[PDB]
Write a protein that binds this ligand. Structure first.
Ligand SMILES: CC[C@H]1OC(=O)[C@H](C)[C@@H](O[C@H]2C[C@@](C)(OC)[C@@H](O)[C@H](C)O2)[C@H](C)[C@@H](O[C@@H]2O[C@H](C)C[C@H](N(C)C)[C@H]2O)[C@](C)(O)C[C@@H](C)C(=O)[C@H](C)[C@@H](O)[C@]1(C)O
Ligand SMILES: [Mg+2]
Ligand SMILES: [Mg+2]
Ligand SMILES: [Mg+2]
Ligand SMILES: [Mg+2]
Ligand SMILES: [Mg+2]
Ligand SMILES: [Mg+2]
Ligand SMILES: [Mg+2]
Ligand SMILES: [Mg+2]
Ligand SMILES: [Mg+2]
Ligand SMILES: [Mg+2]
Ligand SMILES: [Mg+2]
Ligand SMILES: [Mg+2]
Ligand SMILES: [Mg+2]
Ligand SMILES: [Mg+2]
Lengths: 38, 209, 176, 6, 123
RNA sequence: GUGAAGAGGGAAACAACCCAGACCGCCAGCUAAGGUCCCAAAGUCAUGGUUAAGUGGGAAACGAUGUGGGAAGGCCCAGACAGCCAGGAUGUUGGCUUAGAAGCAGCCAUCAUUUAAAGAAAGCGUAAUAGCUCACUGGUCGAGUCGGCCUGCGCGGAAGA
RNA sequence: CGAUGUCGGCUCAUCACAUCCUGGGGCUGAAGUAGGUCCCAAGGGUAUGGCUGUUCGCCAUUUAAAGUGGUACGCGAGCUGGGUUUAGAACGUCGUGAGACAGUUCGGUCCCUAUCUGCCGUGGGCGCUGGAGAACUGAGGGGGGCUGCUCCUAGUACGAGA
RNA sequence: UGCUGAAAGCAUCUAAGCACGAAACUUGCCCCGAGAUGAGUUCUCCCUGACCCUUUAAGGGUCCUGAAGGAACGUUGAAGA
């Protein structure tokens, strides 16, 4: 889980979802590509 | 569970056959006669009220002697209350014996501490003394500093300072019941209980696990 | 809206009783209840339900497609039910059903026990498998996630409780 | 001796 | 009650004659070391041809105290002087081969099973 | 320009900011800046929108299918986007290098066929291959779909005694 | 500037979180043990000595850890007086000299009976609606919250072995 | 960290709904506590006379009466300046 100020899609499997008022990035193939904005 | 009211008789020792010293405190638990039973529909909470000992008939006042004559019990030296649990019921006038603690393994004993009077901060709050030598000027056992400068500019509430120590109600928890002696109204707990010899103690069973 | 406009065909012999916002469905497998949102409108028709956005509410199309799919799966649960299969991977890992309790032994120092809620009945064909029968979809899905939460699959040997329809990713350990 | 601020 | 700077006699044949306690091991802000407690020492005196040299920093175990130990029936066993046995820094096995004077039953465990085997008397 | 040498009303309190220049009295009225739910005088006023953050009532580069508006563009009933079932190839180990490189360590080109379409294959992986996989084309489905610009109001970035 | 006492030590603390330990998690180039990094969390806890006036630092040995900062670089109407700062004296250096140093060295008076606020204790007066003696309820407030090591599970899971 | 689930035929921990989750928070443990002027509750005890006037009203006065209890004094205390 990366906590940074700019979250992005790092491959073609990443998905940007807004959960509870926080922009997150969910990846189905690479658990390294997990990000939240903070 | 309800408790009983006793009297600190003093400390002694119990020798076991494997050669152990057990410091016990002797508590004379006379029978506790129930004076008044409280309920939800009249008092808002469930409790019984017990009295113990005996009082001189020329020393009981007219308000107090009428409260005992309503129950039929004889006038003891005081009145204490105990909160009932769900499933306990008692009747007015019923005497409770020391056999309440027959299979109770641990008790909590609460009493009034000894009075140390006006005690300084070295005795009361375990402060450190300053130097007894090396130049010290009239400042050996004084507290020192009691605050900071202009911010806040006041001493905080709850500051540790000299004052009245002791003579207060304290509860010592989880004492081993060593021996219950029902035929002479005794209860031997293991260890030191609060109070001087001859003071009232309230022995309730242990609430902690 | 693409989900909310395809109607739910009610099959033969399931009592669909609509009372305001509270819906009840009886059937061959059991009786289920789901209090619907205020923003959806349900109407009984010729053996077929319909869901529409109630007026005076802004997000009625989104609430309709959910209320559709939850009632679409209620009529499956009272007719054919649901199922979940959980298999155990790792030596000395075993399960056992005794009543409505599952007895898992997953390499701990104590034995663990899971009390199944009313509506789920588990059975173990093999000692390294669990089959869960249920009439609700969420409850059969949550119970399958609680047994999985005891010992989740590790990425090095695959050990732990896993679904039978779930592929576990594994990876080599770090070279010295 | 540090007698006056200076 | 052994604390820091306390000079102890030595109760084995390792060669040291007086050692000084420089640390009480086994806790933060720890004050005292009774009988059976490891201490960290330094050697102040030594015989010329012993196994240890003056100035060495070793571990020890306190076997006698002038303050004494207490038994579960209230008894006390005191001694006329503080004594210890030098242990190795890491293996914590006794360096010497003999123990002098009596020791107590507080050392009776698996850690110090070799000290109460060489002891002339156990109280 | 104001204070100094200037009171009054507003900006919570606040010489220098805004409105405005106190001769004295009144238990009269009209306005200025500023305001009208309660503290506290006056609209819980009327019509049309926006916000969902208590934003309003601290803070930037940067980030994001938050949401309202506008003008255009691509594909679409000869069937669009998504989902699904399929195929997805052989020449070819294209040649060079490498003990191996066979599309996928590195260099050069990158066609022919059968067809409905398929690459000298975008990526994973591997001793290398294999393997999965995407581009492309069928069938199913039966109504919109895709992503750039200009913009209004919001979200994160946002830790102190 | 008709005076707001300076560095350090002692004593007593109190707050922030940018967390040192303990607590809960994501990623790991995370096999296990042990780590790296990030997120949440301020309840508690958070060394003894040698040298030096030292804060700091280095060193010795511990500890679960020996946090970072604010509070007039917290604290002299609470203590000390070691220091770069009165008057004595000497060295080196500069000046013809009186003297001076940004250099070092030995010696050198630290006052205050608490009116007000604040805080720690402890009482008197009146109220609470006839007076009185007891026992309570509990709105509210305060205290407390740390942690090591050994053994079992088990030399099991993991690991080629260690 | 999830379950079910659309907006967005899929996917999705979230928008509706549901379940876990820490020494932090609210309790549970101990102590003070009805000046809590919002001054609370329960139990018991005590007082059951006559007359006059003005400013006629929670009015003032005379004679008799003095209760429950309290204080005060003494002997003092593991209580205390
Ligand atoms: C016996 C009693 C005497 O007090 C002392 O000896 C104390 C110990 C002095 O400190 C001693 C000791 C010392 C170190 O100061 C503590 C030193 O600096 C002074 C010069 O002498 C004090 C306090 C000095 O004040 C201080 O004077 C400084 C010049 C400035 C300072 N400032 C913060 C206001 C101020 O407080 C000063 C000058 O004596 C005060 C003036 C009024 C006097 O002369 C008075 C009459 C003194 O003789 C005295 C009160 O009788
Ligand atoms: Mg003096
Ligand atoms: Mg003195
Ligand atoms: Mg103030
Ligand atoms: Mg003005
Ligand atoms: Mg004003
Ligand atoms: Mg008004
Ligand atoms: Mg704001
Ligand atoms: Mg002045
Ligand atoms: Mg300071
Ligand atoms: Mg001061
Ligand atoms: Mg001089
Ligand atoms: Mg100078
Ligand atoms: Mg002084
Ligand atoms: Mg509390």
């Amino acid at each position: 889980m990366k906590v940074r100020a700019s979250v992005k899609k790092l491959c073609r499997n990443c998905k940007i979802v807004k959960r509870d008022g926080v922009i997150r990035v969910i990846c189905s193939a690479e658990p390294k590509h997990k990000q939240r904005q903070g | 569970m309800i408790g009983l009211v006793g009297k600190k008789v003093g400390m002694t020792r119990i020798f076991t056959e494997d050669g152990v010293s057990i410091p016990v405190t002797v508590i004379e638990v006379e029978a506790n006669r129930v004076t008044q039973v409280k309920d939800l529909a009249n008092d808002g909470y469930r409790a019984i009220q017990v009295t113990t000992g005996a009082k001189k008939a020329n020393r009981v006042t007219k308000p107090e002697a009428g409260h005992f004559a309503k129950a039929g019990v004889e006038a003891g030296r005081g009145l204490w209350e105990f909160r009932l649990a769900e499933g306990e019921e008692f009747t007015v006038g019923q005497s409770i014996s020391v056999e309440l603690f027959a299979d109770v393994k641990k008790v909590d004993v609460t009493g009034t501490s000894k009075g140390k009077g006006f005690a300084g901060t070295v005795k009361r709050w375990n402060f450190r003394t300053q130097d007894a030598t090396h130049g010290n000027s009239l400042s050996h056992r004084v507290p020192g500093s009691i605050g900071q400068n202009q911010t806040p500019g006041k001493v905080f509430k709850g500051k540790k300072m000299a004052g009245q120590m002791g003579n207060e109600r304290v509860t010592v928890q989880s004492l081993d019941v060593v021996r219950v002696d029902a035929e002479r109204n005794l209860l031997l707990v293991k260890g030191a209980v609060p109070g001087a010899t001859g003071s009232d103690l309230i022995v309730k069973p242990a609430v902690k696990a | 809206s693409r989900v909310a406009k395809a109607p739910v065909v009610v099959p033969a012999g399931v009592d669909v009783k609509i009372n305001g916002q509270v819906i009840t469905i009886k059937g061959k497998n059991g009786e289920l209840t789901r209090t619907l949102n205020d923003a959806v409108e349900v109407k009984h028709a010729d053996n077929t339900l319909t869901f529409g956005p109630r007026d005076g509410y802004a997000d009625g199309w989104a609430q309709a497609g959910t209320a559709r799919a939850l009632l679409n799966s209620m009529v499956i649960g009272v007719t054919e039910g649901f199922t979940k299969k959980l298999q155990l991977v790792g030596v000395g890992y075993r399960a056992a059903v005794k009543g409505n309790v599952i007895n898992l032994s997953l390499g701990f120092s104590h034995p663990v026990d899971h009390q199944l809620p009313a509506g789920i009945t588990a059975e173990c064909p093999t000692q390294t498998e669990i089959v869960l029968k249920g009439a609700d979809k969420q409850v059969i899905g949550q119970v399958a996630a609680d047994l999985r939460a005891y010992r989740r699959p590790e990425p090095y040997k695959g050990k732990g409780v896993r679904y039978a329809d779930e592929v576990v990713r594994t990876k080599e350990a770090k070279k010295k | 001796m540090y007698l006056i601020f200076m | 009650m052994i604390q820091e700077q306390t000079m102890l006699n030595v109760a084995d044949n390792s060669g040291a004659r007086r050692v000084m306690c420089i640390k009480v091991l086994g806790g933060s802000h720890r004050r005292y070391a009774g009988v059976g407690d490891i201490i960290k020492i330094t050697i102040k005196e030594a015989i010329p041809r012993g196994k240890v040299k003056k100035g060495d920093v070793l571990k020890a175990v306190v076997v006698r105290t002038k303050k004494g130990v207490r038994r579960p029936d209230g008894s006390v066993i005191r001694f006329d002087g503080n004594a210890c046995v030098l242990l190795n820094n890491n293996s914590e096995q006794p360096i010497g081969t003999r123990i002098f004077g009596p020791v107590t039953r507080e050392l009776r465990s698996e850690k110090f099973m070799k000290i109460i085997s060489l002891a002339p008397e156990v109280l």
